[PDB]
A = this chain, B = another copy of it.
């Protein structure tokens, strides 16, 4: 029916083995974080390693690659079948762009590099990690050559984490944020409307109190708990898809600052819904699943910030908070909303509010570009970081852990990854104004917990296409236009001005 070409079918049967191995990995990883007694790590680690090598092997097997090149040349394929070919053609090209010994080198350098990152952080001493960063930079440039770019070295790595993304796209979006968000940010600070801190940040809670709250929210979102999804606790919130009918999320309960576990939970719901709403006809195939990190982030941010931080959502949840949190007797829905919408320039990215958040990513983009496209030395980075930080947020890191040693990303050799976060942020606001024209009383829906029509809109515009189309093609198909940072600027204004 959907897949009827004889070659496409042969490709799909061979792919089921690859898919299967992926299902095992997802469970292995999920379990690692959620149930695995600590000493099970070693054996768990070797099993994952072995599986990773196996799947790569299968992906590059001459029979599988050849079948794909053959289908690539067929003229009678339907759009779904063409999706399969497109997706695999790209995975195969990336999977074989790096030589086997280069992959070996990157694996070895990064492992030591991260061990050195942890050392440098524990000693608030950058010199420990410095020499290893220079070796990562060098590898990042070799990597760019391997994938090959066609404009600028940094394009190759940007494309690696967000298919089709070019340095121009990122440059332009941030160019817009510097001319409009920045002054917008400075006015909100002096303005006053929203605070830089809130006492609710300090209120304590017992685990049980907040998990009831989280469970309440998910139920109202219509999360298929026990049926097609689960909620668990782990060290770091994430989402994992075992299948279209088995998507799991996790959150953590710090024991204070309850906004954290909520928005974190809603954030993951955003990702999970994308996977839950995949076209079941695509089950077991390469076109089922979110297309990119950028698009996935647009979904998590849509739910977390476009909805999770709105007054209607706050109003919708308020009675539940009051019902489970004793200290809530002293706070009104206005308190909570202000608490949910704190704007405050600070050092830690993961701590950043939605208005200052992107500038953190903007700084990483700037440095990363210079590192891969130019010839900078690791020793000069920490100071560049602090200058950009002061220039954008008006604060200068006083400790390495407050600046360049925040994230391990560069230590994992993950260069060109960061801008995907801003992509999610901007796209969230952009989708906001688009769903708004099909659902003008969007806010009323949130207040009344009538999320079905919102979820089905996301489903028909984004989720259902899985990976049939690359990110840019997918976005134009959903809203008829390219990504544009202007929408985010409007959202912040409308939000705080």
Contact with B along A51-63 (1 / 0, CB 8 A): 1011000000000
Which residue on B lies nearest to A244, using beta carbons? B43
Which among B16, B37, B49 is the interface contact of A230 at CB below 8 angstroms? B37
A27 with B38: CB separation less than 8 A: no
B47 with A228: CB separation less than 8 A: no
Q: Does A17 sit within 8 A of B, measured CB to CB?
A: yes
B24 with A28: CB separation less than 8 A: yes
Contact with B along A25-39 (1 / 0, CB 8 A): 101100100011111
The segment from A219-227, A325-333, A484-492 that touches chain B is A219-227
How many Å lie between the Cα of A42 and that of B37 in the bound state? 28
List the 4 closest A-B pairs by CB distance, nearest first: A40-B246, A43-B243, A20-B50, A24-B24
How many Å lie between the Cα of A226 and that of B38 in the bound state? 7
Q: Does A173 sit within 8 A of B, measured CB to CB?
A: no
For residues 198 through 255 of chain A, which have their beta carbon under 8 Å from a beta carbon of chain B?
224-230, 232, 242-246
For residue A35, which residues in chain B have a CB less than 8 angstroms away from its CB? 35, 230, 232
Q: Does A46 sit within 8 A of B, measured CB to CB?
A: yes
How many Å lie between the Cα of A188 and that of B125 in the bound state? 77
Which residue on B lies nearest to A34, using beta carbons? B35
How many Å lie between the Cα of A44 and that of B26 in the bound state? 11
Binding site for B on A (CB under 8 A): 16-17, 19-21, 23-25, 27-28, 31, 35-40, 42-44, 46-47, 49-51, 53-54, 224-230, 232, 242-246, 283-284
How many Å lie between the Cα of A243 and that of B45 in the bound state? 11
For residue A53, which residues in chain B have a CB less than 8 angstroms away from its CB? 17
Provide the main secondary structure of the chain A interface. Answer: helix
Distance between A53 CB and nearest chain B CB, rounded to angstroms = 8
B31 with A27: CB separation less than 8 A: yes
How many Å lie between the Cα of A224 and that of B25 in the bound state? 25
A246 with B27: CB separation less than 8 A: no
B39 with A24: CB separation less than 8 A: no
For residue A17, which residues in chain B have a CB less than 8 angstroms away from its CB? 50, 53-54
Which residue on B lies nearest to A54, using beta carbons? B17
Which among B16, B43, B245 is the interface contact of A37 at CB below 8 angstroms? B245
A42 with B230: CB separation less than 8 A: no
For residue A27, which residues in chain B have a CB less than 8 angstroms away from its CB? 24, 27-28, 31
For residue A19, which residues in chain B have a CB less than 8 angstroms away from its CB? 47, 50
For residue A39, which residues in chain B have a CB less than 8 angstroms away from its CB? 224, 227-228, 245-246
For residue A38, which residues in chain B have a CB less than 8 angstroms away from its CB? 226-227
Assess A44 versus B242: contact at CB under 8 Å? Given A20-B51, A31-B27.
yes
Assess A246 versus B37: contact at CB under 8 Å? Given A24-B28, A31-B31.
yes
How many Å lie between the Cα of A466 and that of B28 in the bound state? 25
For residue A230, which residues in chain B have a CB less than 8 angstroms away from its CB? 35, 37
B37 with A284: CB separation less than 8 A: no
Which residue on B lies nearest to A225, using beta carbons? B37
Which residue on B lies nearest to A229, using beta carbons? B37
Distance between A45 CB and nearest chain B CB, rounded to angstroms = 10
B47 with A20: CB separation less than 8 A: yes
Which residue on B lies nearest to A53, using beta carbons? B17
For residue A40, which residues in chain B have a CB less than 8 angstroms away from its CB? 228, 242-243, 245-246
Which residue on B lies nearest to A246, using beta carbons? B40
Which residue on B lies nearest to A51, using beta carbons? B20
For residue A246, which residues in chain B have a CB less than 8 angstroms away from its CB? 36-37, 39-40, 43-44
Distance between A285 CB and nearest chain B CB, rounded to angstroms = 12
Which among B16, B36, B51 is the interface contact of A24 at CB below 8 angstroms? B51
Which among B37, B47, B232, B243 is the interface contact of A23 at CB below 8 angstroms? B47
How many Å lie between the Cα of A31 and that of B240 in the bound state? 14
